[PDB]
Amino acid sequence: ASNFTQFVLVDNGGTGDVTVAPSNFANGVAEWISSNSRSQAYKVTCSVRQSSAQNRKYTIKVEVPKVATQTVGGVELPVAAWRSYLAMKLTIPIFATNSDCELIVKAMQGLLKDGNPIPSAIAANSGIY
Amino acid sequence: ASNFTQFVLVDNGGTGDVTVAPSNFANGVAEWISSNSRSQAYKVTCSVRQSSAQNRKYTIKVEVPKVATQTVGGVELPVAAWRSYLAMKLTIPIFATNSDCELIVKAMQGLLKDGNPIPSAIAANSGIY
Amino acid sequence: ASNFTQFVLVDNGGTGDVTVAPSNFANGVAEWISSNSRSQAYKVTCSVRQSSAQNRKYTIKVEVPKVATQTVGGVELPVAAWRSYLAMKLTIPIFATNSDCELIVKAMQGLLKDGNPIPSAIAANSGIY
Amino acid sequence: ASNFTQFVLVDNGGTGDVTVAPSNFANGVAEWISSNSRSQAYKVTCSVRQSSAQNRKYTIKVEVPKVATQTVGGVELPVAAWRSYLAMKLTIPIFATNSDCELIVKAMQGLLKDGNPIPSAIAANSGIY
Amino acid sequence: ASNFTQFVLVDNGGTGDVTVAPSNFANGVAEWISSNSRSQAYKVTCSVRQSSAQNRKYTIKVEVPKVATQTVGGVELPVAAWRSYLAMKLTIPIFATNSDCELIVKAMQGLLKDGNPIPSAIAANSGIY
Amino acid sequence: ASNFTQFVLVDNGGTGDVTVAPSNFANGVAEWISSNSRSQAYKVTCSVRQSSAQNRKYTIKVEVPKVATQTVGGVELPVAAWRSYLAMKLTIPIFATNSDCELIVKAMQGLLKDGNPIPSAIAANSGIY
RNA sequence: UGUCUAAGACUG
RNA sequence: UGUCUAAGACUG
RNA sequence: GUCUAAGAC
RNA sequence: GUCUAAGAC
């Protein structure tokens, strides 16, 4: 099939959507970046490794930028005022069947679904209480 | 506004859903667990702190049990063969407004949305190809 | 001409066949696996590189699960008791034309053809006698 | 029965066939060579060993020559311009039944069947992509 | 999706075309090789890397062989009488947008378009005059 | 006759075209520069030399600028916010006939033809994937 | 383990 | 493990 | 900088 | 090998 396809990272209903596309696979790290200057692009990376003798570990990262225009030496350049970083490590035993893995994906999706505790605290610059 | 409540971690359309409820708040770290023995339960923990001068950092952890061939309430060893661990670290600059954070959340939801590259790879015991 | 596709690894006449599909391409190494947990799956990997000034070398690996008394989706230990490993290394001089290579392939097919010495010995837990 | 028999290594439909025959078993290594001068002969060798306390390892090798006639000191001699080498190691747990082993042989046969990914890449001086 | 695909390196109408195919991607270095004798094959390699804080750098290489037959001692082999080597370095600031990059590419294409100075000098064994 | 003439470096239909013209030929190094502010001009240089007893070597260079306005102390000047640098070395044996050279050129043109791997990666701020 | 001059060599 | 200047760094 | 070319000097 | 790019380190 090939799962290395582009996808919409930030959905704002058809328009204003942040979509990311395959851009590199050098050294076994799959990379996706948005259609911007390398300095303002959204970035996503993924890699898998047989960490232990009986474990596999996924390493996923996402970079969300706050774009801005900076004047350096009298000249304006496209930059990122700052970047937000998401870094997740996922360890799955080799004994996990496909259905066991689907269970993990579903858990991760439920964890961040709108209305639930965590995504609500994050979106309000708050903690859980 | 008081978000430490029970929520659906794994959704299967009402029937067969996995719910996770508050189980500990020691040290300000929110903990949620399913109705199982702690060796077979679904566990979620979350906490925020200012990691540095310019950043705040959320630390979210999830534990998912291997269910295929599982014996409910039994002693399953080795523990490493029956459990998967997710560790997320979200770094957000102190300049991020609620709007900025809402977008960061959407980015995370899009990353794991059903049908996209990352979740499709994980659910199929695969890497990117 | 774009050969990284799914194929039948174990043929049993349509019914009960074992299919192996693309699962990873990190580092340019093609990987195929069956629809199982990685501890019980059939795995195939392949890659070529120039091993020396005069030679190119293909490195092909295969992993086959022990099926008799197997428990699908279960945790089977020790791993060394439930898996067989095949490691092939094919060295081909840079002077070999496509025709030369076609013959090399035929030589490999003949070596393992049903009814010949090598496969007959292996299939019977025997040596040469 | 006795499996140490001659067999056709390269099949070209009755005529032009490269057939190999038993030629030595000294030191536990079974050898087969084609009917040529030792310097231009196709060669096949096989041996089994109880490698681990619970493993058996087969070591198989095939030598495919590119015959040529070389003039050495004004005299012509039958030689091999170069040789292609196939070297495979197969490790099978002692717990593998005969049917488990038949499964391995079938996997190896399917791996090299015409039309499938690997033999196609090899025959075209190509990699998998 | 993937750009590590085979392509036409030399176009001579429909037939006489030189095609190059993916052969290896070790260490972030993509490599394409034409078919038949590796000794007479065309070669193309490509890689990118962050050369500095504000620059990314591409390293493209091409090898064009002069097909010939070598005879020594009465033994002949397919070889390259000699090779022509092309090596290019392309540095692009991280501020470049997709439009800026598309422009850079057009500049490279125009530099080598039939009829222009550089390509015409090379094709005629000449310099600028 | 002369090949030290002006040519279209960047083609954008009829208008929007970047033309480069002969500006200097000191020390066997031919140089072309686009019109207007030298500070925002495109640059191309070319030279050939006998690199060894049997090889001639070309050195082609291109500079693509990012046009911008610099303001310092209220004084503005036409400048290049930054530049993209291309540098290539082409080695060709003295045995190459005009046909061989025409072939080398076609190889360079194909390497950068629209739709192929290298030009497409560069145009999209990407590597090979 | 890797390579090759290939059942013997080399290299960690 | 922790942090960040983020597939590379730092710190135990 | 060259070459025997992702190795090198 | 990089860059501020036929100058350079």
DSSP code per residue over chain A: ------EEEE-SSSSS-EEEEEEE-GGG-EEEEESS-TTT--EEEEEEE--SSSEEEEEEEEEEEEEEEEEETTEEEEEEEEEEEEEEEEEEETT--HHHHHHHHHHHHHHTSTTSHHHHHHTTT----
E54 touches strand J (CB under 7 A): yes
Give resolution, Å, one decimal: 2.5
Q: Which of C88, B32, E28 is nearest to D85 (CA)?
A: C88
Q: Which of F3, A85, C37, A39 is nearest to B126 (CA)?
A: C37
Residue–nucleotide distance: C29 CA to J5 C1' (Å) = 38
Give yes or no for a contact between F42 and F61, defined as CB atoms under 8 angstroms apart.
no
> How buried is D87 (Cβ within 10 angstroms: 0-12 exposed, 13-18 middle, 19+ buried)?
middle
- What residue of E is the nearest CA neighbor of D79? E75
Indicate the SS3 state at residue E36: coil
> How buried is E72 (Cβ within 10 angstroms: 0-12 exposed, 13-18 middle, 19+ buried)?
exposed
* 3+ Cβ–Cβ pairs closer than 8 Å linking C and E: yes
E56 touches strand J (CB under 7 A): no
Q: Which of E104, A27, A31 is nearest to F120 (CA)?
A: E104
Indicate the SS3 state at residue F55: strand
Domain count for chain D, please give it: 1
Residues in chain C whose Cβ is within 8 Å of chain B:
4, 22-26, 30-31, 33, 37-38, 41, 71-75, 77
AA identity, residue A4: F
- For chain E, the chains sharing at least 3 beta-carbon pairs closer than 8 angstroms are A, C, D, F
Give yes or no for a contact between A3 and A10, defined as CB atoms under 8 angstroms apart.
no
From chain F, the residues in CB contact with A76 under 8 A are 68, 81
Indicate the SS3 state at residue F11: coil
Are residues E39 and C95, on separate chains, in Cβ contact within 8 Å?
A: yes
AA identity, residue D84: S
Task: Tell me the pairing of strands F55-72 and A18-24.
Answer: unpaired
Distance from CA of C91 to the nearest CA of B (A): 26
Residues 6+ apart with CB under 8 A from E3: F117, F120, F121, F126, F128, F129
Protein-covered nucleotides of chain I (CB closer than 7 Å) are: 1-6
Distance from CA of E7 to the nearest CA of A (A): 18
Are residues E95 and A39, on separate chains, in Cβ contact within 8 Å?
A: yes
Query: Whole domain around residue A36: which residue ranges?
Result: 1-129
Give yes or no for a contact between D29 and D45, defined as CB atoms under 8 angstroms apart.
yes
Give yes or no for a contact between B23 and B45, defined as CB atoms under 8 angstroms apart.
no
Q: Compute φ and ψ for D26, nearest 5 degrees.
A: -60, 135
From chain E, the residues in CB contact with F96 under 8 A are 66, 84, 125
Number of neighbouring beta carbons within 10 Å of residue E10: 21
Task: Tell me the pairing of strands E55-72 and D55-72.
Answer: unpaired
Residues in chain B whose Cβ is within 8 Å of chain C:
66, 68-69, 76, 81-82, 124-129
- CATH value at residue B98: 3.30.380.10
Residues in chain A whose Cβ is within 8 Å of chain C:
1-2, 4, 25, 27-30, 47-48, 53-54, 56, 93-100
Q: Which of F38, F13, F40 is nearest to F24 (CA)?
A: F38
User: CA C69 to CA E5: how far, in whole Å?
Assistant: 44
Protein-covered nucleotides of chain J (CB closer than 7 Å) are: 1-6
Are residues D113 and C109, on separate chains, in Cβ contact within 8 Å?
A: yes
Tell me which method was used to determine the 3D structure. X-ray
Q: Token pair of F2, please?
A: 């002369």
**Which residues have CB atoms below 7 Å from chain H, the nucleic strand?**
A 27, 29, 45-47, 59-61, 63, 83, 85, 87; B 49, 51-52, 54-55, 57, 59, 87, 89, 91, 93; E 50
Residues 6+ apart with CB under 8 A from D87: C88, C89, C90, C91, D59, D60, D61
Are residues E98 and A36, on separate chains, in Cβ contact within 8 Å?
A: yes
